[PDB]
Amino acid sequence: QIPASEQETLVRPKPLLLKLLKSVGAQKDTYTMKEVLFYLGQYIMTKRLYDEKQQHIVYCSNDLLGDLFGVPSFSVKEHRKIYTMIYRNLVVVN
């Protein structure tokens, strides 16, 4: 699905994404995609937003994550879709 270089992309989160990131990690201006991806992963895991009997599906209809991504649920295996959902919440910097 994804090239390995993608995680090196330098990004500046939009306000809503930054709000979420600050609840799981230190506040800075610029992140790598690897960092954004990790913090979002930890947010999901700590808040237990996944189905216990169906661990590939994240449910976020009752969470700010749902507002960020614009979906009630998604699969952790759908990597291309996740990248698209994240990208709409940031500006790439070069």
Contact (CB, 8 A) for 24 and 45: no
Q: Is 55 in the site for ligand EYH (CB under 6 A)?
A: yes
Whole-angstrom CA distances from 55 to 9, 44, 45, 51, 52 are 28, 11, 11, 5, 6
List residues near Cl ion by CB under 5 A: 63-64
Q: Which CB sits closer to ligand EYH, 16 or 45?
A: 45
Q: Out of 11, 20, 40, 60, which residue is the one contacting ligand EYH (CB under 6 A)?
A: 40
Both structure tokens of 89: 């919440």
Residues that bind ligand EYH (CB under 6 A): 37-38, 40-41, 44-45, 50, 55, 58, 76-77, 79, 82-83
